[PDB]
């Protein structure tokens, strides 16, 4: 169940932006969003797919652990932080697509599909290239479906080892201080219209957890910081964070 | 351990005495402002919550980081203690009575065996089974803390990998786009000298720096200096911005 709260639209409008934030209060089992229809609109996950891809790679032993080093392939790419060696922690942090494309190739289509059905991940459709389907293939997931997935991960309820789930949650770590912890992943779907930015994850408090999933129209990269900025304004409006 | 006395400026600054120890994991090199004090062994006090958590999890005394340990209804001086807690919050607010109950359930024999496996300090649990790390015979130095923490970091202690991952989760203190700090504070008051502790590590993209500091702490007023002085050292060494 999602209650609509259109007052959050002011934070989009303020920033000349259009999109949706979806929040889920774990203790109360209640959801909230500014736009019910867009909350259920499915889009390409793009880099947010690094969450399930990580889980599958670890569960299958494609990735041994979070210290294993994936050597740069020597190809210079546009994002400078990609042109160096990575481990799982840094490949998540810097959203290093070619590292995850190598995982996908090794996982292979059969296991990939089986896993995404186990996860109930969006439309469970991996059609397209095994190495890019989540960037330009047939898979789609909505913000509310992201939340349903993330809740399973939070509770170690996905059909992969507990260990895999704990390592991915570690790798998702974004921010922590004395008030909250955020575990999350950004994304930016550019290859297929509409261009959209994602931020999905959760906020751990002492006594509750708030799951979130947002997406917004993103015609250029110059708005990418608004993913987190708008989300955090919403969280502050709702007194989830100071 | 190389000595770097220039870090004394940060203690002098704040009218303070103590020691910071750093270990550069990639280079396998350590640095401290005071070699003697780096190796002086003190009561661990609340820093004992690290091994105590590991042992409680490995033995199933704590099932997971969500299990709730209900307040025993006794009002204590630290308000945050007077409420239900889980492992995460018990660590955050350094809730001694929760960890005293763990220690009773663990028991003397298993606690001793585990502290030998960990090579923890002088491996001596003499005193009350639920207070020996506050006012019994156990002693650990800043350099011994680092040896212990390295083993934890690398999942090399003799408890399950899962126990180690959980405790490192529960140690999470600060994270941002520059670093992650996993650490535990302490304040040893019950038996002189009164000293504050901070032990842990800083994770970077490409290295880890382990730390352990202790300082004289005649009152609770100066407790913020544990982190503040450590961070001045880290900043001077270009480990954090
Ligand atoms: C993920 O959506 N990626 C990889 C990288 N992610 O950064 S994000 O997590 O801050 O959004 C850059 C955007 C996106 C991607 O690969 N974009 N380009 C292509 C050709 O798909
Ligand atoms: C730990 O050394 N404790 C518990 C609590 N710790 O907070 S800290 O981690 O900021 O240091 C307060 C101090 C200390 C302790 O229990 N002190 N007093 C007594 C009577 O044991
Ligand atoms: Cl963590
Ligand atoms: Co606003
Ligand atoms: Co299905
Ligand atoms: Co749970
Ligand atoms: Co200074
Ligand atoms: Co012995
Ligand atoms: Co001995």
Count interface pairs A-B at CB distance under 8 A: 36
Burial A1-11 (b: 16+ CB within 10 A, else e): ebeebeebbeb
A contacts of B89 (beta carbons < 8 Å): 206
Ligand 5 centre from A173 Cα, in Å?
Answer: 29
Q: How many residues does chain B have?
A: 241
- Contact across the interface for B174 and A173, Cβ inside 8 Å: no
Cβ atoms of A148 and A39 closer than 8 Å: no
- Tell me the C-alpha distance between A152 and A169, whole Å: 12
Annotation marks residue B46 as catalytic: yes
- Tell me the C-alpha distance between A213 and A211, whole Å: 7
Q: What is the dihedral of CA A28, A34, A36, A37, to 10 degrees?
A: -160
Residue A204 token pair: 């751990």
The helices-and-strands tally (H runs, E runs) of chain A is 10, 9
- Contact across the interface for B169 and A166, Cβ inside 8 Å: yes
Return the closest-CA partner of residue A123 out of A154, A94, A148.
A148
For A71, the enclosing helix (H) or strand (E) is: none
* Residue partners of A2: CB distance under 8 A and separation at least 6: A22, A31, A32, A33, A36, A39, A144
Name residue B31's beta-bridge partners.
B2, B22
**How does strand B172-175 pair with strand B180-188?**
antiparallel
- Answer whether the bond into residue B88 is a cis peptide, omega within 30°: no
**How does strand A173-176 pair with strand A42-43?**
unpaired
- Tell me the C-alpha distance between B137 and B185, whole Å: 20
- Tell me the C-alpha distance between B8 and B15, whole Å: 11
Query: Which residue's entry shows tokens 């408890």?
Result: B159
- Tell me the C-alpha distance between B40 and A2, whole Å: 58
B contacts of A88 (beta carbons < 8 Å): none
Contacts 24+ apart (CB under 8 A), B171-178: B171/B50, B171/B91, B171/B200, B172/A173, B172/A176, B172/A181, B173/A176, B173/B200, B174/A176, B174/A177, B175/A173, B175/A174, B175/A175, B175/A176, B175/A177, B175/A181, B176/A175, B176/A176, B177/A93, B178/B240, B178/B241
Ramachandran sector of residue B228 (left: φ over 0; alpha: ψ -120 to 50; beta: rest): alpha
Burial B189-198 (b: 16+ CB within 10 A, else e): beeeebbbbb
- B1-241: in CATH 3.40.710.10: yes
Looking at ligand 1, which atom is closest to the CA of residue A189? 2
Residue in chain B lying closest to A163 (CA): B162
Determine the 3-state secondary structure of A180 from DSSP: coil
> Measured between alpha carbons, how far is residue B15 from residues A147, B215, B217 in Å?
51, 11, 11
Determine the 3-state secondary structure of A83 from DSSP: coil
Helical axes A143-154 vs A50-59, angle rounded to 10°: 30
Whether residue B63 lies within 8 A of chain A, CB to CB, comes out as no
Ligand 6 centre from B66 Cα, in Å?
Answer: 6
B186 C-beta closer than 6 A to ligand 2: yes
Return the closest-CA partner of residue A108 out of A180, A57, A169.
A57
**How does strand A30-33 pair with strand A2-4?**
parallel
Q: Chain A window 169-198: which residues touch B at a Cβ cutoff of 8 Å?
A: 170, 173-178, 181
Residue in chain A lying closest to B163 (CA): A163
- Tell me the C-alpha distance between B49 and B88, whole Å: 11
Cβ atoms of A213 and A203 closer than 8 Å: no
Cβ atoms of A155 and A169 closer than 8 Å: no
- Tell me the C-alpha distance between A25 and A242, whole Å: 17
Determine the 3-state secondary structure of A120 from DSSP: coil
Cβ atoms of B38 and B142 closer than 8 Å: yes
B44 C-beta closer than 6 A to ligand 2: no
* Residue partners of A91: CB distance under 8 A and separation at least 6: A50, A70, A99, A100
Angle at B165 between CA B164 and CA B168, to 5 degrees: 85
* Residue partners of A185: CB distance under 8 A and separation at least 6: A47, A48, A50, A51, A92, A95, A172, A198, A199, A200, A201
Mind giving me the DSSP string for chain B? Answer: -EE-GGGHHHHHHTT--EEEEEEETTTTEEEES-HHHHT--B--GGGGHHHHHHHHHHHTSS-STT--B---S---SSGGGSS-B-HHHHHHTT-HHHHHHHHHHH-HHHHHHHHHHTT-TT----S-TTTHHHHSS--B-HHHHHHHHHHHHTT-SSS-HHHHHHHHHHTEEEE-SS-EEEEEEEEE-SSSSPEEEEEEEEE-SS-EEEEEEEEE-SSGGGTTHHHHHHHHHHHHTTS--
- Tell me the C-alpha distance between A26 and B154, whole Å: 33
- Tell me the C-alpha distance between A203 and A49, whole Å: 19
> Measured between alpha carbons, how far is residue A22 from residues A33, A37, A237, B137, B212 in Å?
4, 11, 14, 53, 42
DSSP A163: H
Residue A52 token pair: 């399930």
CA atoms within 13 A on the CB side of B78: 11
- Tell me the C-alpha distance between B11 and B57, whole Å: 37
Query: Which residue's entry shows tokens 């002085």?
Result: B229
Interface probe for A, chosen from B57, B169, B185 (most Cβ of A below 10 Å), is B169
CATH topology of domain A1-242: Beta-lactamase (3.40.710)
Catalytic residue among B16, B46, B131, B147: B46
Cα–chain center distance at B167: 11
Angle at A184 between CA A182 and CA A190, to 5 degrees: 145
A contacts of B174 (beta carbons < 8 Å): 176-177
Angle at A142 between CA A136 and CA A144, to 5 degrees: 155
> Measured between alpha carbons, how far is residue B36 from residues A114, B21, B43, B150 in Å?
59, 11, 16, 21
Looking at ligand 2, which atom is closest to the CA of residue B93? 7
- Tell me the C-alpha distance between B44 and B80, whole Å: 21
Handedness of CA B47, B48, B52, B54 (dihedral sign): positive
Name residue B214's beta-bridge partners.
B19, B197
Cβ atoms of A58 and A160 closer than 8 Å: yes
Q: Chain A window 93-122: which residues touch B at a Cβ cutoff of 8 Å?
A: 93
Per-domain residue ranges for chain A? 1-242
Whether residue B29 lies within 8 A of chain A, CB to CB, comes out as no
- Contact across the interface for B180 and A176, Cβ inside 8 Å: yes
Q: How was this structure determined?
A: X-ray
- Tell me the C-alpha distance between B43 and A135, whole Å: 55
Ligand 3 centre from B9 Cα, in Å?
Answer: 33
Interface probe for B, chosen from A96, A156, A166 (most Cβ of B below 10 Å), is A166
CA atoms within 13 A on the CB side of B239: 21
Ligand whose nearest atom lies closest to the CA of B231 = 7
Query: Which residue's entry shows tokens 């349903």?
Result: A148
Determine the 3-state secondary structure of A13 from DSSP: helix
For atom 11 of ligand 1, the residue with the nearest CA is A187
- Tell me the C-alpha distance between A28 and A22, whole Å: 15
């Amino acid at each position: 169940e999602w209650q609509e709260n259109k007052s959050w639209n002011a934070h989009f409008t303020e920033h000349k932006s259009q999109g949706v934030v979806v929040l889920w209060n774990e203790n109360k089992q209640q959801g909230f969003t500014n736009n019910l229809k867009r909350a259920n609109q499915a889009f390409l996950p793009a880099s947010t797919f690094k969450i399930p891809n990580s889980l599958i790679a670890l569960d299958l032993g494609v990735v041994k652990d979070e210290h294993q080093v994936f050597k740069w392939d020597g190809q210079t790419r546009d994002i400078a932080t990609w042109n160096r060696d990575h481990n799982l922690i840094t490949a998540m942090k810097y959203s290093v697509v070619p590292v995850y494309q190598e995982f996908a190739r090794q996982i292979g289509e059969a296991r990939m599909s089986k896993m995404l059905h186990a996860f109930d991940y969006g439309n469970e459709d991996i059609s397209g290239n095994v190495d890019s389907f989540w960037l330009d293939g047939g898979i789609r997931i909505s913000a509310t479906e992201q939340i349903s997935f993330l809740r399973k991960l939070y509770h170690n309820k996905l059909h992969v080892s507990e260990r895999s789930q704990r390592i991915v949650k570690q790798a998702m770590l974004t921010e922590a201080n004395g008030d909250y912890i955020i575990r999350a992943k950004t994304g930016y779907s550019t290859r297929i219209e509409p261009k959209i930015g994602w931020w999905v994850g959760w906020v751990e408090l002492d006594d509750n957890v708030w799951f979130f999933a947002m997406n917004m129209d993103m015609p250029t990269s110059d708005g990418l910081g608004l993913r987190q900025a708008i989300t955090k304004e919403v969280l502050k409006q709702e007194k989830i964070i100071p």
